[PDB]
Every structure is written in C-alpha cells, then in structure tokens.
Amino acid sequence: NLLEEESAVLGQAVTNLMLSGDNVNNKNIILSLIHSLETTSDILKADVIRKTLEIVLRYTAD
Amino acid sequence: NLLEEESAVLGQAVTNLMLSGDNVNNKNIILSLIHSLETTSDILKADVIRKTLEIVLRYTAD
Numbered sequence: 001n002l003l004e005e006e007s008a009v010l011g012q013a014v015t016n017l018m019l020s021g022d023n024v025n026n027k028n029i030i031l032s033l034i035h036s037l038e039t040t041s042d043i044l045k046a047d048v049i050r051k052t053l054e055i056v057l058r059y060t061a062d
Numbered sequence: 063n064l065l066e067e068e069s070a071v072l073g074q075a076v077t078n079l080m081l082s083g084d085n086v087n088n089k090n091i092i093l094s095l096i097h098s099l100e101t102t103s104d105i106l107k108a109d110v111i112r113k114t115l116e117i118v119l120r121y122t123a124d
C-alpha cells in the first residue's frame with residue numbers, strides 16, 4: 001500500500017506524544033519525526049521517516 | 063512493542079483522513095476507527111481497532 005509504512009511511523013509519533021503526556025499537534029508531531037530521523041542510521045528506515053515528515057509538513061502548510 | 067499494532071491502525075486513520083481532504087481531529091479519527099471496526103470481520107484485527115479506539119477515547123476525554 002502506498003503510504004503504508006509512513007502511516008505506521010506517523011501513528012507511532014502520535015502514540016509516543018500521548019505516552020509522554022504531550023499535546024498532539026502539528027508542531028510536536030514534526031519535532032518527534034525530526035527526532036526519529038536524527039536518531040536512525042538505517043537509510044531505508046530514514047527514507048520512511050522523511051516521507052512521513054514531508055506528508056505532515058504538506059498537510060500542515062495546506 | 064506494547065501499542066505497536068494500535069499505532070499502525072491510528073496512523074492509517076490519520077492518513078486516510080488527509081487523503082479524503084478531511085480535518086484531522088478527535089471526532090473524525092474516532093468515526094474512522096468506528097467505521098474500520100464495523101467493516102472488519104476478523105476478530106483478531108477487530109481487537110486491535112477496539113484498543114486503538116479506546117486509547118483515542120481516553121486521550122480525547124483527557
């Protein structure tokens with residue numbers, strides 16, 4: 001499925017925010033994804049986080 | 063991971079809303095999850111959607 005892996009990454013960011021008791025909003029999702037992107041060395045996993053970040057950025061902007 | 067499968071379901075609901083051009087908010091996520099729950103006959107998959115719905119409900123209620 002187009003966007004399947006991205007979905008899972010996005011869903012994890014949302015649950016992670018809820019677990020830390022933070023607000024689920026665009027800013028915090030972005031910061032969480034950027035944090036994930038910066039802490040992954042696996043370029044294949046990095047690709048998935050980057051696409052997820054892009055989709056959130058475009059949804060946020062639009 | 064505890065909450066791993068729930069994460070993926072929640073992430074899918076969020077992407078599905080963005081694809082249909084709808085607002086990403088609590089109401090619409092809940093409605094999307096209820097729709098998924100009502101259209102799944104696989105009781106193992108249903109269990110995951112039900113847990114995801116519960117988590118969103120409890121986060122929403124605060």
Ligand SMILES: CCCCCCCCO[C@@H]1O[C@H](CO)[C@H](O)[C@H](O)[C@H]1O
Nearest residue numbers: 050053054055056057058059061062
């Ligand atoms: C409205 C919000 C716009 C967000 C645009 C997402 C960032 C653009 O995508 C960028 O494209 C290039 C490769 O093609 C760069 O080298 C980056 O790797 C990539 O993130």
Ligand SMILES: CCCCCCCCO[C@@H]1O[C@H](CO)[C@H](O)[C@H](O)[C@H]1O
Nearest residue numbers: 112113115116117119120121123124
């Ligand atoms: C504040 C929002 C509460 C919404 C509760 C979601 C559905 C609750 O229903 C049930 O709760 C029980 C626990 O009390 C059981 O353990 C069940 O697993 C759960 O489905």
